[PDB]
Symmetry: D2
Amino acid sequence: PHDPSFTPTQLAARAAYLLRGNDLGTMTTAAPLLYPHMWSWDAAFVAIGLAPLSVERAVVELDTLLSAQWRNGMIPHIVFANGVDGYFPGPARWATATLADNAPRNRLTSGITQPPVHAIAVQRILEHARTRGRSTRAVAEAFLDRRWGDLMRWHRWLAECRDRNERGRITLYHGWESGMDNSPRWDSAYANVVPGKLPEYQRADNVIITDPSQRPSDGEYDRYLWLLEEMKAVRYDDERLPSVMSFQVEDVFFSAIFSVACQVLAEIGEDYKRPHADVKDLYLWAERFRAGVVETTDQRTGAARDFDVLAEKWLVTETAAQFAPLLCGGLPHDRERALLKLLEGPRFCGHPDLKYGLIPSTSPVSRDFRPREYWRGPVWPVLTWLFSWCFARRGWAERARLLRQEGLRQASDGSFAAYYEPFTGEPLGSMQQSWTAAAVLDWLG
Amino acid sequence: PHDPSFTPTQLAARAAYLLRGNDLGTMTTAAPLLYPHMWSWDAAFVAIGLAPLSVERAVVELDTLLSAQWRNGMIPHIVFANGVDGYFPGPARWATATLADNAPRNRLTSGITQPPVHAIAVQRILEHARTRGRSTRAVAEAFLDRRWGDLMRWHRWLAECRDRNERGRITLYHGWESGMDNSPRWDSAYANVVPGKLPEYQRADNVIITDPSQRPSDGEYDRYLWLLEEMKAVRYDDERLPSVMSFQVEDVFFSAIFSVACQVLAEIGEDYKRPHADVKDLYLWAERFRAGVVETTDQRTGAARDFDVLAEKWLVTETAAQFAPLLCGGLPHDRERALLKLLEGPRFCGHPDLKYGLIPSTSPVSRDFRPREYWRGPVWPVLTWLFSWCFARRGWAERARLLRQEGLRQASDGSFAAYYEPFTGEPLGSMQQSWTAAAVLDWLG
Amino acid sequence: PHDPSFTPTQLAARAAYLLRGNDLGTMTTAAPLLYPHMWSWDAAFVAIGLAPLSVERAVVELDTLLSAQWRNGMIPHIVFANGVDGYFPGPARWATATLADNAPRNRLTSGITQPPVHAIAVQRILEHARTRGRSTRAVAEAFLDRRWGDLMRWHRWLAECRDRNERGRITLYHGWESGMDNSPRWDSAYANVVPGKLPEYQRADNVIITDPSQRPSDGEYDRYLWLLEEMKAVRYDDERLPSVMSFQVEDVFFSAIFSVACQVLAEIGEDYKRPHADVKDLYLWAERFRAGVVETTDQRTGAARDFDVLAEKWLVTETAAQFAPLLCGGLPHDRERALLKLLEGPRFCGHPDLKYGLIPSTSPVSRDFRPREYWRGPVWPVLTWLFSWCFARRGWAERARLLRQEGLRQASDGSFAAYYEPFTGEPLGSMQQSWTAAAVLDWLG
Amino acid sequence: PHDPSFTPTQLAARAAYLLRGNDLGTMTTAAPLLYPHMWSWDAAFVAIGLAPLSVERAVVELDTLLSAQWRNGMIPHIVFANGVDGYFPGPARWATATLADNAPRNRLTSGITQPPVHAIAVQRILEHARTRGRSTRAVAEAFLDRRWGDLMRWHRWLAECRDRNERGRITLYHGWESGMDNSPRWDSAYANVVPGKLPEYQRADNVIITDPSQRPSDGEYDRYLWLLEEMKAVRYDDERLPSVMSFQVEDVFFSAIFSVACQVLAEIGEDYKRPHADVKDLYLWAERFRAGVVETTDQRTGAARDFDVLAEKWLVTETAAQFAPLLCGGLPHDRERALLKLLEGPRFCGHPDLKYGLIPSTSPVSRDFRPREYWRGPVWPVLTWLFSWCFARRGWAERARLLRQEGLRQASDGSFAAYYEPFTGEPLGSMQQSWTAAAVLDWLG
Ligand SMILES: O=C(O)CO[C@H]1O[C@H](CO)[C@@H](O)[C@H](O)[C@H]1O
Ligand SMILES: O=C(O)CO[C@H]1O[C@H](CO)[C@@H](O)[C@H](O)[C@H]1O
Ligand SMILES: O=C(O)CO[C@H]1O[C@H](CO)[C@@H](O)[C@H](O)[C@H]1O
Ligand SMILES: O=C(O)CO[C@H]1O[C@H](CO)[C@@H](O)[C@H](O)[C@H]1O
């Protein structure tokens, strides 16, 4: 009644209880109702949240994700659970098992990718394992032995097939690959997707999630599905995709994450005596994509811009993706101070109506802002976690601590919502979201 | 390495993670390997540990236990899980489904009982539910509606069938019913059990638990099983059991718990407008068994004694059961001060070699003390929990806090062992014990 | 900014910082400017707050107060700091140094008393000292050797001089002695106090606290000061006050505190082998004042009433003092359930407009309620602490816990105010009150 | 008894209690009896410890130190408390009031300096103040207005007067200025200090700390005091010290601190709009001293070496000062990995006999190691704090965390010692050291 918040220990217990409840055996669902399968970057966050509970089970999560890796290195964004339906588009719609020569054997997966946060999860598992003694270190190190080459092939497929022109930015062929499906970032690119006649479909996500204010519209999923048809018509061939996709964007946030991931993976490889050629490639990619992120930035504010490859125009929007350069580094001193000022000022974390000092997914003063609508305004604990972890790595200890502290306060209701209304703090969307429990577990220490 | 202990939040998360991992769906195993079924007083502790995580699931645990209640009110001490084997004596050995007219339908259970801590679990669920708002209160109150009469019938069967002469003490027909199977308390009663030819058996608990120093011997399980044959030969008939059992003891610790349970259940019934006749009976039983506990006590020390009904002699041993009167109250002032002095002095919590200020199951200076052997010396977190909760209820706030604090320190290794070596703090016995996680969760708040 | 409150460690640090900043050397001021001297029941709370910081300095605080005890055993309610002004009425107005034959020789004091919480402070000092090792235990035990006789003389003075008819209630000759100067409890008794020729004066208290809504009015002060003239005219002679005092009330809250204090001090004397005749006297007084409190109570609700000795009339008001019987026990079971229901319902802690689940000094629905006016409504952390500590001693562990939780949450702003607006939570009166810091330190542990 | 340590809240409270008890009013003593005056780098730590208690009082502590700054910008290492004795050498021995033209007019000080951690204290004060609201921010900002020029003059004095050749390292004329009086770093430099006619004296430091194994020897003090005679003979003239001083060493640890401090103060001047020419100077010095530190380093391990200016020889010793480059950055990637390996391995933090995972002041395997002797081996919480804070600024969040965790665990005894025996954990030297309390308060948050 008077205080619906949970104590830190009650909150940690409930978060761990949620993670174990979402565990199907070898994979954790992204969320029981809305997302009853394994999602790629949710799984990396899940592995971080499991690392304080069981290094063995955190490793199993990544082991299961990488068993679904495509022949060519791509980590698909969904690994479908054995016979679980409920979700759409499902494996039948994707048809990767019969169409894609690179699809894995005895996993059903999607045909698209998602951001490479996995090296970060590996670092956190390693750091936990080193606090727990010899046998737990053995587990983490045996994992590195098993999966280092798979991780390299993941990073190499991004660097060679989604940055074909060595521009230092990752090209996406669907907004789902950004992790921020309905972000204002992609409105103008989706606006140029004109679909033909697409096979008949019954939407599945809105049956469970009632409120249309906290879900995407019906015109969105028509184009969302047309892109799937385009990929199918070329059997998900990497060499043919540029010739046919009606959606081709360089995602600057995805690219900054990849830069950071490369640097983290490189330092792991140094510490664990991995092949020198692998470490050298990872440092080369880290620097290339740092450079590719900085090339997009506004000269006065430092704001990073996405790039629409088909239209050949910078996508200028006011979302949290503008702060990509803060994650990977590389901006000139003055331009970075300018970007921190934007982050902390009234267009983002300093907006006077915000309940928490946290980063809204879209600026409240932007014309595209919708306080309830996924990535068009709400605050996402997973973004708070990622910014706070990257800020700590830049040496911004106090900024990272402020994000953690406000993130823990917002999460203390124990809804483990995927996102929160930025003004009222109302939990929104799916409750029971695995990666919000994971963020809380990693924060609480 | 330097500090193998977990922080309070890490420990709470791991405890909740263990409880959810031990959940079969509607019941929680007492321990994954050694005890893969539902045990009666473990389940009550499990429900307490679940109450901070999910009032709904805490209620389900007790709902599942009471669906196995016998026609006559007895709560059996094991509810066997659907088809899980591994344990012995199993349902085949017990044969209650075909022999006992009172056995439940579509549960497999044992034919013996275990201490009535369930009202305490109900209180803790109620107290949690009242902090969580209207819908969670509705769940707890709907449970009371469903199960109040079952709880009354539980208490009434103890009061009328295991205290047939209204002496205010519970008679047991097997040491397993005490919850402290191999306690020195029962050595002289087991010594008078001479068995015939008992059906051939292969012990199951020692296959998983290697060390014979932390398990009971082979002569113990021969008599343990002979008693089972005696109960079978009279189809578990309550009226016939006194005529035939070779083991009949009044358990003073069990009786003190029942007294406390009656008082707790009575106060619940007052608060939730249960029938007046039920509340009045519960207060009558609380006072009868308080009186029955006090009648056993040594006039100088207050130590409570068990009673061997067949031998007609007070069982004088130096175990933690001597402190039964401290739980239920009723001793004269001076005699209670004397008993607290014994509890805190060098024969128990004040012994100079103890690692924690906690109650050893048997006094280290006793001839029967074995530092590694179950209830013959080790410290059990479940006993710490129960003494600390009962002490708080007597108003001994500081004593209760000291027990909690030392219990949390001992448990901070995260083994969730059932018992610990009293001198070195080594975790012993089964790890992953549900009710040790439960105690930690309730303590941490 | 986004959350003004402090973490538990920051709060504990700031409480300790305040307590040391108010330390004049051997005494601690009740508040820096408003109350720049030693108050008697504040000093007990101060000693409780110092015990986790320094047992040696906690003992010093009580040594200093007891060095000011009158020759007849009275502990006076103010011990003035040498050569400190800024509080009225000061030493010159009281004129005890010149008029009172029983006043101390090396100290300047007031000529009235205050509630006997001192034994509770001695119990907290002893409980802290027992956890800290041998040299610290010796410090606490030497304090007992040195001051047990003084504590007995304090309790004996109250029992014989302020309960001359052995009614088991404490008579007060000034509302200041209740600790609740402007409580509605005293309104009708004050209306019968007619000041005669009262020598001129200027308040100093409302030059520091200038908001007129937070302190008593001029008219109330004229009566407060006139009572001093009546005492001074008989030179503070115990034997003459009944014949001359225009204010004579039996204070049931003070009486319940005394009952508890006697029982606490008796238990200490048993533990530390004090003379048996003293322990016997203390247990006798504990019971006598318990019965005297219960004798006052409403037959339906259990509410305790003060008694106007001059008017020979029960004083019926709706203040926190009604709950006196919950502190000391003694009510029939049914009427204590009713009384608890009154405490927890809409007239007190369950009032729907309260910011915290705490006890307002006057019921929000009483005609006498004033949300800002001292003891006429505001929430006082000192009352919270006493209720929570005494509840825990009754065995009401969850009730005590909830009051402690809500008190920490209210106190988390770090103002250390003496009282708070019950609806908005605004801190009122003087900031930096030592006994609020002390409550916070004891709660946080 | 069973666990001597304190909870985080009890520890925080006791740290704050100590800091306020050492407060003389406008300055805080370094330790009650041993160091009963204001030491310069202790005072910076004191200001860090006060910032979560009172921004106003933290600012006062730095105001008091800066009011004692010399006319040429030097911050002297002792500001003597008015009319306080018990420390030698006191104001009369130093004779700065009479001999030093640059000494302050309203203050008595020493005639040597100490490391410039002051800018780090200003950053912590500002970070605290930004979380506390408008009036508190104004207090911190007014401090900046009032003292920025003084801080610049401090940094400028070091950069121009103690690095006259622009080598980017700070020359010291007394081992006391390093903060590490008896470090093995200075042994060979001290062996070349020959006292002439040295006026008689009695130590006061080893009358308080009487165990001869914890303080420097008589022979060391004769050299310490003779250096004072050489300074006094040239009236503390910066321009003459190079010609007369028998002790002239470049201190690489002091130099790294200065590099960090310059960078911190530059960042503050940018945030708070200080003159651009000042920010430019600070960034220039930051880089110059970073390069001067790196120039000293071992080509294989990265270890930094001090330089004996008179002997023109690198000083190779195995102390914590070797790790100077980790504070300020600048090493090539490979050699910093080597240096981190040295810090974490068996020669320092990974030595198998260490009670805590902390940095001993001298390596346990060095011939110079002495487990009790001041800076020749003991673990100093001040070093832990500086390393952990600077590590976090490098982005090594887990390394910084581990040092903070081990430092809290060592400090949890509440002794607030300045240094600890590396193997047993025994607190050494003076208890009640303010800057250990300050580190604990900052760590606990
Ligand atoms: O891809 C989709 O169909 C839906 O995507 C949403 O759910 C995923 C699982 O939680 C997240 O991985 C995404 O970030 C989020 O936007
Ligand atoms: O009954 C048995 O066969 C074995 O009994 C042991 O295991 C049970 C499950 O943990 C506990 O309920 C008992 O207290 C404990 O003694
Ligand atoms: O006695 C007075 O003159 C003023 O009294 C107030 O201040 C005292 C010091 O905090 C408290 O002890 C009282 O309870 C409170 O009513
Ligand atoms: O300078 C001195 O005479 C004595 O020096 C010691 O005491 C100081 C105060 O704590 C510290 O600042 C030094 O680091 C430490 O070495």
